[model samples]
Target chain A: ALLSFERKYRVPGGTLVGGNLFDFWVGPFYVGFFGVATFFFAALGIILIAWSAVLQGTWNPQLISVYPPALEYGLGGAPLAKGGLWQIITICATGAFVSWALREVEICRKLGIGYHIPFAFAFAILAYLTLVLFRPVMMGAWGYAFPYGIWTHLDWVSNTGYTYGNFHYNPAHMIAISFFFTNALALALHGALVLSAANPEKGKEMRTPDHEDTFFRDLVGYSIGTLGIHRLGLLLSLSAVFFSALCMIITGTIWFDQWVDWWQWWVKLPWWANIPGGING
Target chain B: DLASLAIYSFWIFLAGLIYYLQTENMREGYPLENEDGTPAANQGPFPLPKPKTFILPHGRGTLTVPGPESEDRPIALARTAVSEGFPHAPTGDPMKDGVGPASWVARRDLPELDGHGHNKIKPMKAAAGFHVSAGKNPIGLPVRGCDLEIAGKVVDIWVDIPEQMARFLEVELKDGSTRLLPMQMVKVQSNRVHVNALSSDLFAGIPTIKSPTEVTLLEEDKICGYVAGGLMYAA
Candidate 1:
């Protein structure tokens, strides 16, 4: 299925490991060692999820949930029915995600491109780890982790947010939300800029990045160059996920108090105390 | 619990180490320095190829697609009148100069004036005499030939922003391309339009712009020339 011009760049010898053995492709899919591992982990994870559904006595997708062990089960391993399947599924999910990332890395290596794709994916994996692994361990119980279900996870978030007297007041959560919003704004500008350059009137040739630069420059008096916009996009998106993971980790671990009460430090500052009607004064 | 934490930390450390090593390996030949203690220009694993210079057809002079200092130069614009005249225009470098290049200006900035020096077009949906009734849009009516053959359909109606009158009718040919017909060229009937100048196949060659919203000055000239040419050589 190779195209006529695809023969040139299809040269081998850029594999990170396993040499030419795993360098081949299967019907447009590169089947490296990590590919095999991804399939193994993903299949096992699906089987375990189904098995949990069977044990739960309900086949309903909405009702089927695999919950972590009760808080008393703490550091000790649980029985098969008591969150053992969840623990195994967590491992399998981690295995599949990490394998997928390494598979991306292998593909980038073979193509002689930078490892930016896998680097970006690592932040997503880090967020998942913060939720199920790091945060749960930090809270001294697996029950602290959200259950693996479509609706139950959202319920957990809502309940957990309210548990901390509104997650909106959480500094890390606020920063993460702000980053997520700003990422959308930055991407909107970049997408519009690129499309405006490429799509000119018929019979008129397409514009270059200079026009894109000028469009933004004339409108805002500043233009993030083509290369700089991509860097900015990456920075914005990665920081969004990074702060989300930090928000999850900080909850019920470093600060067990209500998130709103955490603002007391600001009100109790020496400068605020000198004010006429300040909180401390 | 400590053992579990230790294991997780070890895996994280291993992942970080692998990523760092792979990144270091990927940075091969980046500094572009020679081993003989002299600065080398293209001493890298992926050194850029030499730029090719060529002259445009019809004696437009030599133009280099990419050169040694190409990275430092601003990107080239399309072959429009503005781009041709202002090739080295700055793109608003505040530190370098007060004002730089201006790419796109508002349509209202350069208003299209009619023969009477008035904006002659308005949205047909809002204009009088363009529509059969108050609410029904004249657009989407089929344009028929003299022998009652379906030539094309009126897909859009261009309006002058300042004059508040319909200027042109956008017709869609059978090949899915569009051509702008002057309002005078189309004879509006009960349910369809009549264009006696050109047939369906001839309408395909009419010059048209890529988008419906905007048309450049150069594109307008070519489009008007093609339509005028078709009228003069009407079969």
Candidate 2:
């Protein structure tokens, strides 16, 4: 019952590591060495989470979070329950993500396709690292990161942002948020535009690319074209996460104090500084 | 002589751009700090550029670059350690504290319009001349929460017109008020919409949209975070 063209792309030999040992597919899914590697780490990571839940005395999923070591841990390993749960999961999160990333590579190679998905997706993975890996390590402590629980992480994130005194003031963060919003809005527009023409159903007649370009042209006096939107989206989406990555990395590393305090330089500039009546007044 | 003038003008423009770029970058975080509140000893090199006032879009006010700092209240947080460069811990419940997961950014309380300036997302009832076509319409379907208990019923579909896609399902809870449920979260099968993230009792907790027909960007963020909050809150 296989499709006509499905068999051609199923050929092996694109494995990045482990060779033919794990290059085969399982039913509908392909399994590469990284897939196996990811499975091992991800599964172990989950089991550790369960163990942490058990030790914490609450099986409540919301309450079941593992905190990072106290700030006193100072980038050093601590006991299992204190902050170790977060560390293991962080490592596994990275391992799992990298493994999955490599597995994406294998799929791309086998299909002889472009690496746009993986390359664009790397920034997302990097954003995660920017928080738990890069920023924490750079700050010289592991506790600088949030814990593994849902509520606690939220609290920690809030606290951490406040610690920097309005992380929104961080230039990279502002840029990242703007990019994210722009990217989503673009996706929203592109999706609506495509759906209006394609997916012919009921009384719907299939609107072609001509209609799409025209629809946007009428809507905004210009259309970047069908291919242009995706390219723009690729750029926008990647830029969003790339800036998000840089945003967190720079939080403590570059500006370790309240982000608001960093703006005094703007206030201290010559234009307003030497005015007849200025901020000093 | 024309070529020489062109090159000289280009150099002047380049210098102006360099000044503009460096000054624009100093819009925030200009004076450095060393994990402490006070200004750092080294102010760094770079002369300040002339201030440029920018007119805010959407009829907002004007803002001058390199403007004076706005007064802000102390944040609800305390330092975790005596050491520098350490993270701060929240003083109150982080979820309700509105800093982390509970935190929602202050977007203008205005509905995001489509490129055509019409309401971006509207209920199917409000959006005339559109109805479900081939697929099973989940309208009036009983919504089952995480515990498979009755949470609400899908009263209407909020369609993103420009995208011609369903954005949110208007779920009417026991309180008679409706909340926007992201369409992707529900399974539209048989006669019910199964919401796996939240329980029946927690349905009321979904963030309320401010407008009857239009949802603002701020409401969108809160609604998004509200549903996501159920992942842990209901867990």
Candidates' C-alpha lDDT: 0.65, 0.73
| Angstrom error at residue B140, model 1 | 68
lDDT of 2 by residue, A1-281 (tens): 12211332233345779766776664446788887988999999999999989989999987988888899989989888888878888889899998888889887765544567888778888888878888889999998887888798899889988888768889888999999999999999988888776544554334455567777888889888765798899999899889888888877787788887778898779878666665564
Best by lDDT: 2
Q: Fraction of reference contacts reproduced per prediction?
A: 0.00, 0.00
| TM-score: model 1 vs. ground truth | 0.54
Provide interface RMSD per model, one decimal. Answer: 22.1, 22.1
Considering only chain A, what is the TM-score of each predicted structure?
A: 0.94, 0.92
Residue-wise C-alpha lDDT for candidate 1, range A1-281, written one tens digit per residue: 22211222233434556765566555446767788889999999999999999998888999999998888999667886888998999999999999999999877654434579999999999999998999999888888988999999999999999998878999998999988999999999998888765555543445555567678879999887766788898998999999999987988888988999898788768766467763455
Tens-digit lDDT track of model 1 for B1-235: 9999999999999998876654444232233322222344543343333444443222234444333221122322222123111112223321122111111111122224443333344435444455533534558899875446887899878775433345678788888877777665568877998876555555666656655554445445444544433332333
- What is the TM-score of each predicted model, taking all chains together? 0.54, 0.53
Q: Residue A101 in candidate 1 has what lDDT?
A: 95
Q: What does the lDDT come to for candidate 1?
A: 0.65
